[PDB]
Design a binder for this molecule. Sequence first.
Ligand SMILES: Nc1nc2c(ncn2[C@@H]2O[C@H](COP(=O)(O)OP(=O)(O)O)[C@@H](O)[C@H]2O)c(=O)[nH]1
Ligand SMILES: [Cl-]
Ligand SMILES: [Mg+2]
Length: 343
Amino acid sequence: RATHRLLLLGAGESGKSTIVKQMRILHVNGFNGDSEKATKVQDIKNNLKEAIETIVAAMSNLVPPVELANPENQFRVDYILSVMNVPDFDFPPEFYEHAKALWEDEGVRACYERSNEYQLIDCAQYFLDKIDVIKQADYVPSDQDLLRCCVLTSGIFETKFQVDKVNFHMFDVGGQRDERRKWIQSFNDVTAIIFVVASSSYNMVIREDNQTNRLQEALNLFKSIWNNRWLRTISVILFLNKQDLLAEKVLAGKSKIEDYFPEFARYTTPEDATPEPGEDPRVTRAKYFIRDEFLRISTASGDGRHYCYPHFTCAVDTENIRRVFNDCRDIIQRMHLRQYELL
Ligand SMILES: Nc1nc2c(ncn2[C@@H]2O[C@H](COP(=O)(O)OP(=O)(O)O)[C@@H](O)[C@H]2O)c(=O)[nH]1
Ligand SMILES: [Cl-]
Ligand SMILES: [Mg+2]
């Protein structure tokens, strides 16, 4: 009975393309068949190789550098560096055995744990932990494997689908810095903006300059969107994404939010916080602090004729996104009448 046009906005690697993948799983045909699977098997292997070669290459460049725990692995390091830039790598059995032995080296792992000091795809641990699965000749990627796959294709990508007679036309708008000049061109008859944030990347810097904090970049972009003159009446659904990785990072206790956002040291969990069942209170405090950084922007200015709807999301978790998207569906249905509450 209606067609809604939703824009996914957000910095690079925030989760936009992953959300589209979930929409296709839920409302189209997912990753289609063996042809797509097979063609995308190469992306998974290339992620695995990118992960291990990035970690290995970073060891000598960290300050202080990190050495192998077992010097017997030196030839494996050399092999990985040697094939780092081979086009169309063929992934023979020895690649997996060498990658796995390096992944198990405590020095390589120690370098991995300092990955916020270089640029490492978030799916590194996921794929490195299942080398034995991926290396099998009869390996077929699961939907989760394909969701975790990191392929940062620039451009604007679109999906359209119907749910209970309502159409949703969703735009995955590339958000790396050199793509943002194009954002305004997708603002054609927008129902709502979905702004996606990598909540877990508070201790990381962006690829574009290897200097600007990733979460600060997201906050700056959200401020740009929230206060934009041509979005004053367009509400913003905020996906505070990567909640799984955020919880892991908070609980590991090695990278403190307050070293990057000092006001966290004085931050108390709000009284109206609604932690999930089983949630560690340290994670609640972290995720609500990050939420409240965005809500401070949305309450500070630009709040005239639109609302912000925050959600905690895990874009690789299909059931999580089913639930959040259904909440979005209801938010959208309720927007028309809610607009009359505004002054
Ligand atoms: N563990 C986890 N990984 C995520 C989440 N969202 C995205 N990822 C991964 O982050 C990486 C980049 O996501 P992507 O959608 O391609 O980024 P974008 O299109 O540039 O916004 C992919 O490897 C995704 O699998 C999340 O909530 N949890
Ligand atoms: Cl982000
Ligand atoms: Mg993308």
